[PDB]
Amino acid sequence: HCRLCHGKFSSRSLRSISDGERVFVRDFQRLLGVAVHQDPALSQFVCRNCHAQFYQCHSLLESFLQRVNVSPM
Amino acid sequence: HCRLCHGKFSVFVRDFQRLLGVAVHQDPALSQFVCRNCHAQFYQCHSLLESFLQRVNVSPM
Ligand SMILES: [Zn+2]
Ligand SMILES: [Zn+2]
């Protein structure tokens, strides 16, 4: 059960939970100003492509935010 | 001059401010054109992140 497209997978799945490089809950919450909460109802896990596709978005939007309002060099 | 990648060529200003949380300046210093790839890549990320927001915090109904 992938949190972001709803599909079910073998180990085509990455954990979001720790008890630093990169941390999904925080990175999601920062970029889109919206948190990701823990029920038994919900899975601890997101699929390889959905996690890949998230950080490809994170990278390019960080790059937009560095540049949008600064004069070229 | 692309406002988003900083290079030369030859709806968005709201949509940016909503998604990320940060306005686009209309300083005369900066140039009110954005590239076809920048524009494409922006809305690819708009669509995909809206889709992630619909699904993140629901058990599959
Ligand atoms: Zn997925
Ligand atoms: Zn560009």
PDB file of N, CA, C and O in Angstrom, chain A residues 4 24-36 50 53-55 57-59 61-62 65, chain B residues 15-22 42 44-56:
ATOM      1  N   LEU A   4       0.746   7.451  -1.790  1.00  0.00           N
ATOM      2  CA  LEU A   4       0.612   8.573  -2.794  1.00  0.00           C
ATOM      3  C   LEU A   4      -0.084   8.189  -4.112  1.00  0.00           C
ATOM      4  O   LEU A   4      -0.510   9.145  -4.787  1.00  0.00           O
ATOM      5  N   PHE A  24      11.121  12.247   4.384  1.00  0.00           N
ATOM      6  CA  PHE A  24       9.947  12.393   3.481  1.00  0.00           C
ATOM      7  C   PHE A  24       8.835  13.229   4.114  1.00  0.00           C
ATOM      8  O   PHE A  24       8.406  14.208   3.417  1.00  0.00           O
ATOM      9  N   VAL A  25       8.394  12.877   5.334  1.00  0.00           N
ATOM     10  CA  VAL A  25       7.275  13.546   6.084  1.00  0.00           C
ATOM     11  C   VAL A  25       7.540  15.067   6.050  1.00  0.00           C
ATOM     12  O   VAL A  25       6.735  15.818   5.352  1.00  0.00           O
ATOM     13  N   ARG A  26       8.724  15.466   6.572  1.00  0.00           N
ATOM     14  CA  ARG A  26       9.192  16.883   6.698  1.00  0.00           C
ATOM     15  C   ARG A  26       9.218  17.515   5.309  1.00  0.00           C
ATOM     16  O   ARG A  26       8.465  18.440   5.106  1.00  0.00           O
ATOM     17  N   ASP A  27       9.935  16.910   4.374  1.00  0.00           N
ATOM     18  CA  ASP A  27      10.129  17.420   2.991  1.00  0.00           C
ATOM     19  C   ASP A  27       8.785  17.651   2.283  1.00  0.00           C
ATOM     20  O   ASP A  27       8.658  18.691   1.557  1.00  0.00           O
ATOM     21  N   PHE A  28       7.809  16.764   2.517  1.00  0.00           N
ATOM     22  CA  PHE A  28       6.427  16.869   1.971  1.00  0.00           C
ATOM     23  C   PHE A  28       5.834  18.101   2.621  1.00  0.00           C
ATOM     24  O   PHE A  28       5.619  19.076   1.872  1.00  0.00           O
ATOM     25  N   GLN A  29       5.773  18.091   3.965  1.00  0.00           N
ATOM     26  CA  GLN A  29       5.178  19.177   4.802  1.00  0.00           C
ATOM     27  C   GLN A  29       5.747  20.546   4.451  1.00  0.00           C
ATOM     28  O   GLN A  29       4.956  21.469   4.376  1.00  0.00           O
ATOM     29  N   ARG A  30       7.064  20.638   4.230  1.00  0.00           N
ATOM     30  CA  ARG A  30       7.739  21.902   3.885  1.00  0.00           C
ATOM     31  C   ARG A  30       7.212  22.376   2.522  1.00  0.00           C
ATOM     32  O   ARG A  30       6.628  23.477   2.488  1.00  0.00           O
ATOM     33  N   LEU A  31       7.320  21.551   1.478  1.00  0.00           N
ATOM     34  CA  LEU A  31       7.127  21.975   0.054  1.00  0.00           C
ATOM     35  C   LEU A  31       5.667  22.402  -0.196  1.00  0.00           C
ATOM     36  O   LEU A  31       5.464  23.375  -1.008  1.00  0.00           O
ATOM     37  N   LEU A  32       4.720  21.612   0.321  1.00  0.00           N
ATOM     38  CA  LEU A  32       3.268  21.717   0.025  1.00  0.00           C
ATOM     39  C   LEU A  32       2.467  22.235   1.245  1.00  0.00           C
ATOM     40  O   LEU A  32       1.188  22.098   1.215  1.00  0.00           O
ATOM     41  N   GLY A  33       3.123  22.797   2.280  1.00  0.00           N
ATOM     42  CA  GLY A  33       2.500  23.261   3.539  1.00  0.00           C
ATOM     43  C   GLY A  33       1.360  22.385   4.070  1.00  0.00           C
ATOM     44  O   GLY A  33       0.342  22.987   4.452  1.00  0.00           O
ATOM     45  N   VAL A  34       1.487  21.054   4.028  1.00  0.00           N
ATOM     46  CA  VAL A  34       0.473  20.045   4.483  1.00  0.00           C
ATOM     47  C   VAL A  34       1.137  18.756   5.069  1.00  0.00           C
ATOM     48  O   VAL A  34       1.824  18.012   4.321  1.00  0.00           O
ATOM     49  N   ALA A  35       0.839  18.394   6.321  1.00  0.00           N
ATOM     50  CA  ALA A  35       1.432  17.244   7.061  1.00  0.00           C
ATOM     51  C   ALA A  35       0.831  15.901   6.598  1.00  0.00           C
ATOM     52  O   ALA A  35      -0.177  15.940   5.877  1.00  0.00           O
ATOM     53  N   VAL A  36       1.421  14.782   7.070  1.00  0.00           N
ATOM     54  CA  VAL A  36       1.186  13.349   6.702  1.00  0.00           C
ATOM     55  C   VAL A  36       1.108  12.569   8.030  1.00  0.00           C
ATOM     56  O   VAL A  36       2.190  12.365   8.607  1.00  0.00           O
ATOM     57  N   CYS A  50       6.831   6.728  -7.016  1.00  0.00           N
ATOM     58  CA  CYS A  50       6.110   7.891  -6.401  1.00  0.00           C
ATOM     59  C   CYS A  50       7.122   8.681  -5.562  1.00  0.00           C
ATOM     60  O   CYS A  50       7.084   9.919  -5.635  1.00  0.00           O
ATOM     61  N   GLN A  53       9.572  10.367  -8.131  1.00  0.00           N
ATOM     62  CA  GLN A  53       8.795  11.453  -8.776  1.00  0.00           C
ATOM     63  C   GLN A  53       8.578  12.614  -7.793  1.00  0.00           C
ATOM     64  O   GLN A  53       8.546  13.771  -8.262  1.00  0.00           O
ATOM     65  N   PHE A  54       8.478  12.358  -6.489  1.00  0.00           N
ATOM     66  CA  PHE A  54       8.300  13.438  -5.477  1.00  0.00           C
ATOM     67  C   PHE A  54       9.580  14.306  -5.436  1.00  0.00           C
ATOM     68  O   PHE A  54       9.467  15.520  -5.491  1.00  0.00           O
ATOM     69  N   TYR A  55      10.756  13.690  -5.301  1.00  0.00           N
ATOM     70  CA  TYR A  55      12.046  14.401  -5.124  1.00  0.00           C
ATOM     71  C   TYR A  55      12.484  15.045  -6.446  1.00  0.00           C
ATOM     72  O   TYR A  55      13.140  16.074  -6.398  1.00  0.00           O
ATOM     73  N   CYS A  57      10.353  16.484  -8.262  1.00  0.00           N
ATOM     74  CA  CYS A  57       9.525  17.710  -8.107  1.00  0.00           C
ATOM     75  C   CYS A  57      10.139  18.677  -7.091  1.00  0.00           C
ATOM     76  O   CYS A  57      10.241  19.862  -7.384  1.00  0.00           O
ATOM     77  N   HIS A  58      10.548  18.149  -5.960  1.00  0.00           N
ATOM     78  CA  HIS A  58      11.237  18.867  -4.866  1.00  0.00           C
ATOM     79  C   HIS A  58      12.480  19.582  -5.422  1.00  0.00           C
ATOM     80  O   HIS A  58      12.576  20.805  -5.209  1.00  0.00           O
ATOM     81  N   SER A  59      13.340  18.858  -6.154  1.00  0.00           N
ATOM     82  CA  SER A  59      14.596  19.395  -6.733  1.00  0.00           C
ATOM     83  C   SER A  59      14.238  20.579  -7.657  1.00  0.00           C
ATOM     84  O   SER A  59      14.746  21.699  -7.378  1.00  0.00           O
ATOM     85  N   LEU A  61      11.519  22.411  -8.022  1.00  0.00           N
ATOM     86  CA  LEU A  61      10.807  23.550  -7.380  1.00  0.00           C
ATOM     87  C   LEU A  61      11.765  24.316  -6.462  1.00  0.00           C
ATOM     88  O   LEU A  61      11.766  25.512  -6.563  1.00  0.00           O
ATOM     89  N   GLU A  62      12.651  23.664  -5.729  1.00  0.00           N
ATOM     90  CA  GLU A  62      13.760  24.331  -4.994  1.00  0.00           C
ATOM     91  C   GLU A  62      14.530  25.219  -5.967  1.00  0.00           C
ATOM     92  O   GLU A  62      14.787  26.380  -5.582  1.00  0.00           O
ATOM     93  N   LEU A  65      12.652  28.303  -6.831  1.00  0.00           N
ATOM     94  CA  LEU A  65      12.545  29.215  -5.659  1.00  0.00           C
ATOM     95  C   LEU A  65      13.849  30.001  -5.468  1.00  0.00           C
ATOM     96  O   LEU A  65      13.741  31.170  -5.150  1.00  0.00           O
TER      97      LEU A  65
ATOM     98  N   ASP B  15      -0.705  30.540  -9.752  1.00  0.00           N
ATOM     99  CA  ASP B  15      -0.540  29.063  -9.600  1.00  0.00           C
ATOM    100  C   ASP B  15       0.749  28.714  -8.836  1.00  0.00           C
ATOM    101  O   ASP B  15       0.698  27.776  -8.016  1.00  0.00           O
ATOM    102  N   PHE B  16       1.832  29.455  -9.104  1.00  0.00           N
ATOM    103  CA  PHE B  16       3.150  29.390  -8.420  1.00  0.00           C
ATOM    104  C   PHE B  16       2.920  29.769  -6.966  1.00  0.00           C
ATOM    105  O   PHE B  16       3.100  28.888  -6.114  1.00  0.00           O
ATOM    106  N   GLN B  17       2.392  30.978  -6.721  1.00  0.00           N
ATOM    107  CA  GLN B  17       2.147  31.537  -5.346  1.00  0.00           C
ATOM    108  C   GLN B  17       1.302  30.563  -4.513  1.00  0.00           C
ATOM    109  O   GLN B  17       1.710  30.321  -3.367  1.00  0.00           O
ATOM    110  N   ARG B  18       0.283  29.939  -5.101  1.00  0.00           N
ATOM    111  CA  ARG B  18      -0.586  28.984  -4.384  1.00  0.00           C
ATOM    112  C   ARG B  18       0.249  27.755  -4.002  1.00  0.00           C
ATOM    113  O   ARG B  18       0.420  27.542  -2.775  1.00  0.00           O
ATOM    114  N   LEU B  19       0.848  27.070  -4.978  1.00  0.00           N
ATOM    115  CA  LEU B  19       1.519  25.732  -4.802  1.00  0.00           C
ATOM    116  C   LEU B  19       2.641  25.776  -3.759  1.00  0.00           C
ATOM    117  O   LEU B  19       2.645  24.877  -2.873  1.00  0.00           O
ATOM    118  N   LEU B  20       3.561  26.741  -3.909  1.00  0.00           N
ATOM    119  CA  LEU B  20       4.875  26.784  -3.212  1.00  0.00           C
ATOM    120  C   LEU B  20       4.758  27.669  -1.972  1.00  0.00           C
ATOM    121  O   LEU B  20       5.223  27.233  -0.916  1.00  0.00           O
ATOM    122  N   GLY B  21       4.115  28.831  -2.114  1.00  0.00           N
ATOM    123  CA  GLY B  21       3.735  29.739  -1.010  1.00  0.00           C
ATOM    124  C   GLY B  21       4.502  31.049  -1.052  1.00  0.00           C
ATOM    125  O   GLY B  21       4.799  31.593   0.052  1.00  0.00           O
ATOM    126  N   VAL B  22       4.844  31.551  -2.248  1.00  0.00           N
ATOM    127  CA  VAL B  22       5.885  32.610  -2.462  1.00  0.00           C
ATOM    128  C   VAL B  22       5.528  33.362  -3.767  1.00  0.00           C
ATOM    129  O   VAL B  22       5.345  32.684  -4.771  1.00  0.00           O
ATOM    130  N   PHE B  42       6.789  22.985 -14.696  1.00  0.00           N
ATOM    131  CA  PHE B  42       6.023  23.576 -13.559  1.00  0.00           C
ATOM    132  C   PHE B  42       4.668  22.839 -13.390  1.00  0.00           C
ATOM    133  O   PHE B  42       4.379  22.386 -12.258  1.00  0.00           O
ATOM    134  N   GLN B  44       3.545  19.977 -14.914  1.00  0.00           N
ATOM    135  CA  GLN B  44       3.808  18.527 -14.647  1.00  0.00           C
ATOM    136  C   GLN B  44       3.888  18.318 -13.131  1.00  0.00           C
ATOM    137  O   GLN B  44       3.215  17.404 -12.633  1.00  0.00           O
ATOM    138  N   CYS B  45       4.619  19.186 -12.434  1.00  0.00           N
ATOM    139  CA  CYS B  45       4.771  19.138 -10.965  1.00  0.00           C
ATOM    140  C   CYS B  45       3.494  19.611 -10.265  1.00  0.00           C
ATOM    141  O   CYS B  45       3.250  19.101  -9.140  1.00  0.00           O
ATOM    142  N   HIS B  46       2.732  20.540 -10.854  1.00  0.00           N
ATOM    143  CA  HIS B  46       1.447  21.046 -10.300  1.00  0.00           C
ATOM    144  C   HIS B  46       0.463  19.883 -10.234  1.00  0.00           C
ATOM    145  O   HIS B  46      -0.053  19.567  -9.118  1.00  0.00           O
ATOM    146  N   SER B  47       0.272  19.232 -11.387  1.00  0.00           N
ATOM    147  CA  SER B  47      -0.688  18.106 -11.571  1.00  0.00           C
ATOM    148  C   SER B  47      -0.315  16.982 -10.608  1.00  0.00           C
ATOM    149  O   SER B  47      -1.149  16.669  -9.753  1.00  0.00           O
ATOM    150  N   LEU B  48       0.939  16.529 -10.664  1.00  0.00           N
ATOM    151  CA  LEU B  48       1.455  15.405  -9.835  1.00  0.00           C
ATOM    152  C   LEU B  48       1.338  15.715  -8.328  1.00  0.00           C
ATOM    153  O   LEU B  48       0.951  14.764  -7.580  1.00  0.00           O
ATOM    154  N   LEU B  49       1.629  16.941  -7.886  1.00  0.00           N
ATOM    155  CA  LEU B  49       1.584  17.220  -6.430  1.00  0.00           C
ATOM    156  C   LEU B  49       0.116  17.338  -5.971  1.00  0.00           C
ATOM    157  O   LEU B  49      -0.184  16.731  -4.927  1.00  0.00           O
ATOM    158  N   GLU B  50      -0.781  17.947  -6.763  1.00  0.00           N
ATOM    159  CA  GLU B  50      -2.244  17.914  -6.488  1.00  0.00           C
ATOM    160  C   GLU B  50      -2.720  16.453  -6.324  1.00  0.00           C
ATOM    161  O   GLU B  50      -3.420  16.162  -5.347  1.00  0.00           O
ATOM    162  N   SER B  51      -2.283  15.556  -7.190  1.00  0.00           N
ATOM    163  CA  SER B  51      -2.619  14.106  -7.140  1.00  0.00           C
ATOM    164  C   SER B  51      -2.098  13.455  -5.855  1.00  0.00           C
ATOM    165  O   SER B  51      -2.850  12.636  -5.265  1.00  0.00           O
ATOM    166  N   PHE B  52      -0.874  13.797  -5.439  1.00  0.00           N
ATOM    167  CA  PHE B  52      -0.292  13.300  -4.167  1.00  0.00           C
ATOM    168  C   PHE B  52      -1.117  13.799  -2.976  1.00  0.00           C
ATOM    169  O   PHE B  52      -1.355  12.985  -2.054  1.00  0.00           O
ATOM    170  N   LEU B  53      -1.614  15.036  -3.027  1.00  0.00           N
ATOM    171  CA  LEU B  53      -2.400  15.657  -1.914  1.00  0.00           C
ATOM    172  C   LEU B  53      -3.777  15.004  -1.745  1.00  0.00           C
ATOM    173  O   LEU B  53      -4.152  14.762  -0.599  1.00  0.00           O
ATOM    174  N   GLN B  54      -4.459  14.673  -2.841  1.00  0.00           N
ATOM    175  CA  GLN B  54      -5.741  13.900  -2.859  1.00  0.00           C
ATOM    176  C   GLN B  54      -5.600  12.506  -2.212  1.00  0.00           C
ATOM    177  O   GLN B  54      -6.585  12.045  -1.632  1.00  0.00           O
ATOM    178  N   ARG B  55      -4.440  11.852  -2.299  1.00  0.00           N
ATOM    179  CA  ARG B  55      -4.230  10.392  -1.969  1.00  0.00           C
ATOM    180  C   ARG B  55      -3.465  10.135  -0.659  1.00  0.00           C
ATOM    181  O   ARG B  55      -3.709   9.015  -0.057  1.00  0.00           O
ATOM    182  N   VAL B  56      -2.540  11.044  -0.284  1.00  0.00           N
ATOM    183  CA  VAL B  56      -1.643  10.925   0.908  1.00  0.00           C
ATOM    184  C   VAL B  56      -2.432  10.519   2.158  1.00  0.00           C
ATOM    185  O   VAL B  56      -2.047   9.479   2.789  1.00  0.00           O
TER     186      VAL B  56
END
